[PDB]
């Protein structure tokens, strides 16, 4: 019995710029 | 019995700039 | 920006019995 | 931007019995 | 920016019994 | 019995700049 969700994962975000207004 | 969620994960964010206004 | 691998994950094992021989 | 691999994932095993020989 | 691997995860094992022999 | 959430994790943020206004 094993449970192994989301293993070995990568995310990359390159040069993001945020100009949001609130 | 094992539970091994999210193992080995990477995140990269490269040169982010935040100019947000509140 | 979020990364959430294996997030919110569940395992349930109910009344397991082990009689293994080695 | 979200990344959520294996998110919300479930396993259930009910009354397992192990009789393995080694 | 957040990274949250395995976040919010649960395991339950209910009334396990071990009679293993070596 | 093991529970092993989020093991082996890396995060990298490279040369971030924060100019946020409140």
Residue numbers in the entry:
A (entry chain C), B (entry chain A), C (entry chain B), D (entry chain D), E (entry chain E), F (entry chain F): 297 to 318
From the paper:
The assembly of tau into amyloid filaments is associated with more than twenty neurodegenerative diseases, collectively termed tauopathies. Here, we describe twelve phosphomimetic, serine/threonine to aspartate, mutations in tau, which we termed PAD12, that collectively induce the *in vitro* assembly of full-length tau into filaments with the same structure as that of paired helical filaments extracted from the brains of individuals with Alzheimer’s disease. The tau folds of AD and CTE comprise residues from R3 and R4 and the carboxy-terminal domain.
Solution-state nuclear magnetic resonance spectroscopy suggests that phosphomimetic mutations in the carboxy-terminal domain of tau may facilitate filament formation by disrupting an intramolecular interaction between two IVYK motifs. Finally, line shape analysis revealed that residues 297-319 of wildtype tau297-441 displayed reduced peak intensities compared to tau297–391 and PAD12 tau297–441 (**[Fig fig6]**). Residues 392-404 of wildtype tau297-441 also showed similar attenuated peak intensities compared to PAD12 tau297-441. Such an interaction, which may resemble that between the two protofilaments of the FIA, could inhibit filament formation in the absence of phosphomimetic mutations. A similar interaction, which was also impeded by phosphomimetic mutations in the carboxy-terminal domain (S396E and S404E), has been hypothesised to occur between the microtubule-binding repeat region of tau and its carboxy-terminal domain based on FRET measurements.
